Structure formats: structure tokens, C-alpha cells
Amino acid sequence: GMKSILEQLSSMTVVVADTGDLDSIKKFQPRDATTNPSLILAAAKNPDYVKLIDKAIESSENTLPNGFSEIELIKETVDQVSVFFGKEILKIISGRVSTEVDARLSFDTEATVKKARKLINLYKNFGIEKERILIKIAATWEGIKAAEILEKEGIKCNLTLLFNFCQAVTCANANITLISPFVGRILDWHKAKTGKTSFIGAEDPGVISVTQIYKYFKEKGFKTEVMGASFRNLDEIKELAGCDLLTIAPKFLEELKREKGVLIRKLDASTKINNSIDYKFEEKDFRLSMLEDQMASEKLSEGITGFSKAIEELEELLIERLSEMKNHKLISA
């Protein structure tokens, strides 16, 4: 001591800087980070990292059967470039890289499982073992089912677009490695629905939900890690002090380090042995509970759409790079 709020928090929670690009990963050195379409779009703007994009195109060209089409090339490249960038992240960070599974497959268990397997085998081909990877999947019924299958073969999953207790419990019962609820998106939905201008501290509906999920998971002895993410304000983070992980904007990290005073570990549950109900949500109950939760079903649907938009934009960028690559060869001696 004296102990900053950040130092207190770090004694209770694995704190990870929220990063969306490689420069920020290098700067902040987060324990965990993510390869996804948006990070790669960001990198395309960088004269260093864009070369790694062109390399994925070249590698995909080498990989495919003779006579491949441009469509087949772009598809294969989307896979390879995601892995190239994940390997680049693993050279910087000490922990795990979340690897986004194409969100367009979010309602297809078999396709999600097959894509995860493909990405894991690509990582293996490039010298990276599966324990360094989290396969990141939207928490639809089908995505959780795919993760259930994957976990059984030792492929660790991060279940994201996770908004309610129903989704959390379904993941826990399926032995999912990690869930990443987006707290600030839950807050946003309630403000947007009601015109309430704020939900302060413990009243924040995202904080309420993640608090409940954490308490249940620990009391029941579930192994699934809870990573609170996507924060709108610093009070949300403080309310969830003691969560397994919290992904936090660099500016909030700096502010917590500046602050003094007392931070209470609110998320402090441990295993209990008692007669409380063990909740289960089989497919029908899951679907009905989701239907009744307008917040979770809309934020899940919008999130999937947003992920799908960014992967479509990636595909468009790869088409551009291919064109540029061809032009450069034709005009060079």
C-alpha cells in the first residue's frame, strides 16, 4: 500500500484491458485478447499488419485445389487470416486468444462445430495448441449445443452475446469454459425501452444479471468462468468487483489506478451444499424463456447481425487486397 482501487480490484478479479486492435494489444499487454473481423479490418489500415492479410491470401491460394474460384479463395482466406492474427496476438499476450466463429453460422450447430474444428486444426498447423485458444460463439441454443460438443473434445469455448440467467445456466450445465456477458448492452436496452436516463450502481440491470449469474455459478460449484465485458461506466465495473475476469477500457484502468478509497468485493460467493433447486433449461424451456426476455432476444439478434456485418466487411476488404495484389504484379518489373 497505499492500495489504489485498481490494486484492490486486481486482488479480486483478473483485470484485462479491452483492446480491439493489435497496436492496443502491444501497448496494454492484456492477459487475454481476441481475433475477430473488426481487429483485422483495423489492421488493414496499417502498413505493417496489412502484409499479414496479403500473406493469408497467398497461403489460401497455395492451400486450395487447382481450379479454385475467387469465392472459394475468399472463404478460405477468412479462416486463415483469423488464425494468422490470433497467432500474432499469442506472440504478445500470456493468456488465451478468443477466436470468433463466423456469426452467420450462429443457428447451425453442425457448421459451428465444423468451423471450430477447422480453426483449431489451423492453429495446430501453425504450432499453436488448443489450450491457448478460446473458440468464441454466440449463445444461441445451437451455439451452446456446438460448444457442448467442442468442450468434450478439449476445445475451450467463450460463449458471448450472453444476456440472461437462462443462457448462463444452459452454458454452465454444458460445461462451457467461459461466458462473456455484455453488461453495458443490457443497460442500453433498458434506457432505450423506457427513457429512464440512468440506472445507478446496483440498480444497473446488467450488473443485477451478472451478479446473480456469478453467485449461482460459485455456490453450485460450476467451473465456467465469468468475464464481464462491454461497460458503459465505471460504477458497473465496481459493482462486479470479484468477478472471475472483467474486460475494461484502458481509460478506466487509468482512472481506477488514480483513485483511492475502499472497493468492496461484492462478487464473493463460494461453494454451498444445500437443498436449493438445480435449474435446467432443455431446448423448449430455453426457447420459451428467451421468447419472454425481449432484452436478451433482441440484443442476441442485433449482436449476431453486427458480427455478421463485420465479417461481410472483412470479405469485401479481402476482395480489395486480392485486386491490389494482382495490380501490383502487373505494373511491376
Ligand SMILES: [Cl-]
Ligand atoms: Cl437461441
Ligand SMILES: [Cl-]
Ligand atoms: Cl444516454
Ligand SMILES: [Cl-]
Ligand atoms: Cl510483385
Ligand code: NA
Ligand atoms: Na482446401
Ligand code: NA
Ligand atoms: Na471464419
Ligand code: NA
Ligand atoms: Na459463412
Ligand code: NA
Ligand atoms: Na455501491
Ligand code: NA
Ligand atoms: Na476472482
Ligand code: NA
Ligand atoms: Na465480427
